[PDB]
């Protein structure tokens, strides 16, 4: 019944309406947790992982002035470490936490059913007014690809010590 797994039955919780819903849930976490909660978690992971992957590639290509001096040539998680002492990561953590407070309120609403998961109403340029379904599917697809991409980048960095593009350039 499941489209993703032709021989396995469609997950009971997955209605198929949600973006990126192809009936892929072999283990059954949908029954374990509320589907709205899981959808919010998935979209949050999608967005943070997209930013992380784009940041890995963009940090390989270019480094902001002064940050290079503070970092001392370190890359990826090494940069994190160098910058934790400066407090840069401290500012990022503080402000992300401040945003996540209102994220907590929004998730209270979502679990109450008043708000759609992942809907922060942030469309300043109105790019999603035309085809919201297509835009949401693109968000979920690119977010999953970016989660796996940042996983691959980080683990290639752990293996070699090189960066996302540097490893491609030379092995």
């Amino acid at each position: 019944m499941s489209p993703s797994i032709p021989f396995l039955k469609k997950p009971d919780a997955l209605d198929g309406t949600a973006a990126g819903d192809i009936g892929f849930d072999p283990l059954g976490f949908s029954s374990l947790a509320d589907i709205k909660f899981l959808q919010e978690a998935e979209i949050k992971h999608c967005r943070i992982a997209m930013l992380a992957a784009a940041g890995s590639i963009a940090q390989d290509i270019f480094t902001f002035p002064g940050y290079s001096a503070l970092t001392g040539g370190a890359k990826m998680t090494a940069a994190h470490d160098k910058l934790v002492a400066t407090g840069t990561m401290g500012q990022i953590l503080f402000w992300v936490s401040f945003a996540e407070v209102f994220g907590t309120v929004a998730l209270f609403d979502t679990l109450d059913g008043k708000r759609a998961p992942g809907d922060f109403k942030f469309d300043p340029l109105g790019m999603g007014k035309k085809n919201m379904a297509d835009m949401q599917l693109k968000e979920i697809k690119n977010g999953r690809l970016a989660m796996l991409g940042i996983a691959g980048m980080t683990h290639g960095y752990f293996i070699s010590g090189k960066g996302p593009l540097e490893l491609l350039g030379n092995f």
């Binding site: 929004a106 008043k114 109403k121």
Partner: peptide, 9 residues
Amino acid sequence: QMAVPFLQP
């Protein structure tokens, strides 16, 4: 207009 538009008024 509401300051936080994803939250109940």
